[PDB]
Amino acid sequence: LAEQALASKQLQMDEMKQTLAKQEEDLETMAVLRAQMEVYCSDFHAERAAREKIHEEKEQLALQLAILLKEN
Amino acid sequence: ALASKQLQMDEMKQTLAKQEEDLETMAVLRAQMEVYCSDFHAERAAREKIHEEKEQLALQLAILLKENNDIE
Amino acid sequence: MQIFVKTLTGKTITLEVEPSDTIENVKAKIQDKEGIPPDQQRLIFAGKQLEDGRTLSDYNIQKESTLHLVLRLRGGMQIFVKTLTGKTITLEVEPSDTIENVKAKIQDKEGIPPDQQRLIFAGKQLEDGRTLSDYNIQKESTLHLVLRLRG
């Protein structure tokens, strides 16, 4: 009955190789995926910084706006 | 070649396992990248808006400035 | 169904939920437990994103199953505060938020204890009991931090 068990094992093995290959492909996908989120993160901090800067500038401009407006 | 099959199956099991875990991790990484992307776009929107507001005030100031410079 | 959650660093403590309890309910349990708002809890069901307008039966939340939460970079609401040095810092908040909670977040960014902080929104000094919602503090409102004791 060893022949049947060897044919079954070889079948299951063909299946394992299939799955592991598809798997490795997905893992490559994951490395570029990590790089990508790190970028989005970077972009977000860059943008918050810009927003914060514009907010200070804006508040300055607005102050002068109030004082000059009621002054003249 | 039965010992070969059970052994090779054991190692194969090691890798398949590590694999499914990595598939879970990367499953989280994609969610993460879509969220960081979403957030980054939100902050860019906000940045872009406060920035136009700033330009409004800046224009208006330049104009008033030249309106009370020219008339004196 | 007692149920658990993996986090970005990964964290798990005491819990219970029912198939009828909203997908917003579990995340609300997450806010109550971890001090992390609902608009910052990104929830997954085994590599799939738990959405809104669907009970945890709609996926479904079997007991002893690992959903996932990772932290959104920001929330829906943020306000600016003018700093002791006149610089802008921006804070993640909710209208729910008490002034005691905002002063904790400012203590977080700038390291001055809330007992030495005074917050001014529209000429008005804000008291540690009330909320941002009450004071009609909206998106992008600026508050001025000052040293209580005047400085």
**Whether residue C32 sits in one domain with residue C72:** yes
Residue C136's region, left for phi above 0, alpha for psi from -120 to 50, else beta, is: left
Any idea which residue has 């008339």 for tokens?
B71
Q: Based on the structure, what is the number of domains in chain C? A: 2
C88 and A56 within 8 Å at the Cβ level: the answer is yes
- Burial class (CB within 10 angstroms; exposed 0-12, middle 13-18, buried 19+) of A57: middle
Could you tell me which residues are beta bridge partners of residue B59? none
**Whether residue C51 sits in one domain with residue C7:** yes
Within 8 A of A20 by CB-CB distance, chain B residues are 12, 15-16, 19
Reference A59, options C77, B58, C139, C146; nearest CA is B58
What is the rounded distance in angstroms from the CA atom of residue C147 to the CA atom of residue C104?
15
Secondary structure class of C121 (helix, strand, coil): strand
Q: How are the residues of chain B apportioned to helix, strand and coil, as percentages rounded to the nearest 5?
A: 95, 0, 5
**Whether residue C65 sits in one domain with residue C81:** no
Resolution (A): 3.0
Its domain, for residue C38, covers: 1-76
**Whether residue C81 sits in one domain with residue C52:** no
**Whether residue C121 sits in one domain with residue C94:** yes
Using alpha carbons, list the distances in angstroms from residue A72 to A59, A60, B60, B65.
Answer: 20, 18, 14, 11
For residue A67, the distance in angstroms to the closest alpha carbon of chain B comes to: 11
